[PDB]
Amino acid sequence: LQEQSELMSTVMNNTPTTVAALAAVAAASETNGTIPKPRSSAQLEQLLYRYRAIQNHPKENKLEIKAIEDTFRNISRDQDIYETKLDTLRKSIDKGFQYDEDLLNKHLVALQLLEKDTDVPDYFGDPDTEIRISARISNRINELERLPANLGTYSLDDCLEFITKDDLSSRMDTFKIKALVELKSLKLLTKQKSIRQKLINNVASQAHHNIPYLRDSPFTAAAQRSVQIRSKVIV
Amino acid sequence: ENNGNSVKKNWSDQEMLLLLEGIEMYEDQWEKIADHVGGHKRVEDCIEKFL
Amino acid sequence: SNIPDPTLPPTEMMTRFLHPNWYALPTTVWLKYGNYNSWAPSFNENGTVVD
Amino acid sequence: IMIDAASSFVLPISITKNVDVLQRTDEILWFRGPSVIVNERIINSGDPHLSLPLNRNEKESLPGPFVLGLRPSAKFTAHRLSMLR
């Protein structure tokens, strides 16, 4: 039940000693399914730091201190292993390789595009695959709609304008317009679809009076000629 | 801004934003879209850019 | 406005298209008179495209 | 909740003798509320004066408000003025 978010909620509510998660087998082990080895850089580790620093006062009501300290031992051991491996890795380098430039370009651009979830070109119907497109657009809409409205730039070209304490520079909004062109272009999609239908179903709906090589064929001219035959008058 | 921009078919982000604001406003009425862009663009080019 | 969300089930854009290269053209109509009528005019071509 | 209230007013007496420093219409504009003075527009989002990390009663008299406002350093501005011409 997200104990690694329950610690964050108890920290941000500023009352963590008053509850202390009721560390028994019935409560502290029901959310764990040891502790699950936190994932973040420090956002789930500083919480463990503060949690141990608050639980130094009771020291016996909470039996889960030992598994947390075992994970501190694991973190210290992994850190010492990485420091020894970084000491050896800087000694295992060849004296000459002369890494190529125009492949370093491609690795940097490819890593940068693979960070922020966009498609990388290689250079090295069916409503199953219709929903898998219409579920990537809701991703982008509900990711752009969580940006703060007070978003603003600071380009490297405001130094040539000498902005005072209150001067209102003229390149402050080169990202918030761009973060609304996407968010409103991804909501006007089923309007340009309905305009493209009215375009194609009135250009292709003639198809034999505008295109020259179709209205000059034998069979099209014969069909258009034969539909215009006025019915025979008996007597 | 309010100034006349550069040579046409550039479509700065201000004009794209005001075009999409107009399409959210009126849903039709491309004269009322093309003046809301700024009036220095024709109907026959706002439709060619929204498509 | 009154536009829909782009996560609605009509996202088809080509359902009832029917280009006029795909139209049915008028051709000859073979007729059947009976079991023992082998001298009659067998078919009918009023406004046909092909023979 | 209305939007189209006037919220600016002009008195009829032309007192335009010592008023070249205020905001003139082109008379004097008289609003329905005061102004708002904002020190610095851009917040400095890190800076443990403001971010308050959870590790480790103290005062500090920082120089000015200009610490909290992303000012560029002068060596870049001289470099860019050298790149000007």
From Swiss-Prot, chain A:
It is found in: Nucleus. Disulfide bonds: none annotated. Transmembrane segments: none annotated. Belongs to the SNF2/RAD54 helicase family. Interacts directly with SFH1, CSE4, histones H3, H4 and H2B, and via its N-terminus, with RSC8. Interacts with LDB7, NPL6 and RTT102. Component of the two forms of the RSC complex composed of at least either RSC1 or RSC2, and ARP7, ARP9, LDB7, NPL6, RSC3, RSC30, RSC4, RSC58, RSC6, RSC8, RSC9, SFH1, STH1, HTL1 and probably RTT102. The complexes interact with histone and histone variant components of centromeric chromatin. Catalytic component of the chromatin structure-remodeling complex (RSC), which is involved in transcription regulation and nucleosome positioning. RSC is responsible for the transfer of a histone octamer from a nucleosome core particle to naked DNA. The reaction requires ATP and involves an activated RSC-nucleosome intermediate. Remodeling reaction also involves DNA translocation, DNA twist and conformational change. Present with 1990 molecules/cell in log phase SD medium. This is Nuclear protein STH1/NPS1.
Swiss-Prot record, chain B:
It is found in: Nucleus. Residues 6-51 form the SANT domain. Component of the chromatin structure-remodeling complex (RSC), which is involved in transcription regulation and nucleosome positioning. RSC is responsible for the transfer of a histone octamer from a nucleosome core particle to naked DNA. The reaction requires ATP and involves an activated RSC-nucleosome intermediate. Remodeling reaction also involves DNA translocation, DNA twist and conformational change. Dimerizes via the C-terminal coiled coil. Interacts directly with HTL1, NPL6, RSC6 and the N-terminus of STH1. Component of the two forms of the RSC complex composed of at least either RSC1 or RSC2, and ARP7, ARP9, LDB7, NPL6, RSC3, RSC30, RSC4, RSC58, RSC6, RSC8, RSC9, SFH1, STH1, HTL1 and probably RTT102. The complexes interact with histone and histone variant components of centromeric chromatin. Present with 3380 molecules/cell in log phase SD medium. This is Chromatin structure-remodeling complex protein RSC8. The gene is RSC8. The chain holds residues 305 to 355 of 557 of the full protein.
UniProtKB/Swiss-Prot annotation, chain C:
This is Chromatin structure-remodeling complex protein RSC58. The chain holds residues 252 to 302 of 502 of the full protein. Component of the chromatin structure-remodeling complex (RSC), which is involved in transcription regulation and nucleosome positioning. RSC is responsible for the transfer of a histone octamer from a nucleosome core particle to naked DNA. The reaction requires ATP and involves an activated RSC-nucleosome intermediate. Remodeling reaction also involves DNA translocation, DNA twist and conformational change. It is found in: Nucleus. Component of the two forms of the RSC complex composed of at least either RSC1 or RSC2, and ARP7, ARP9, LDB7, NPL6, RSC3, RSC30, RSC4, RSC58, RSC6, RSC8, RSC9, SFH1, STH1, HTL1 and probably RTT102. The complexes interact with histone and histone variant components of centromeric chromatin. Signal peptide: none annotated. It comes from the Eukaryota. Present with 4460 molecules/cell in log phase SD medium.
From Swiss-Prot, chain D:
Disruption phenotype: Heterochromatin spreading downstream of the silent mating-type locus HMR. Transmembrane segments: none annotated. It comes from the Eukaryota. It is found in: Nucleus. Present with 2330 molecules/cell in log phase SD medium. Component of the chromatin structure remodeling complex (RSC), which is involved in transcription regulation and nucleosome positioning. RSC is responsible for the transfer of a histone octamer from a nucleosome core particle to naked DNA. The reaction requires ATP and involves an activated RSC-nucleosome intermediate. Remodeling reaction also involves DNA translocation, DNA twist and conformational change. Belongs to the RSC1 family. Component of the two forms of the RSC complex composed of at least either RSC1 or RSC2, and ARP7, ARP9, LDB7, NPL6, RSC3, RSC30, RSC4, RSC58, RSC6, RSC8, RSC9, SFH1, STH1, HTL1 and probably RTT102. The complexes interact with histone and histone variant components of centromeric chromatin. This is Chromatin structure-remodeling complex subunit RSC2. It comes from Saccharomyces cerevisiae (strain ATCC 204508 / S288c).
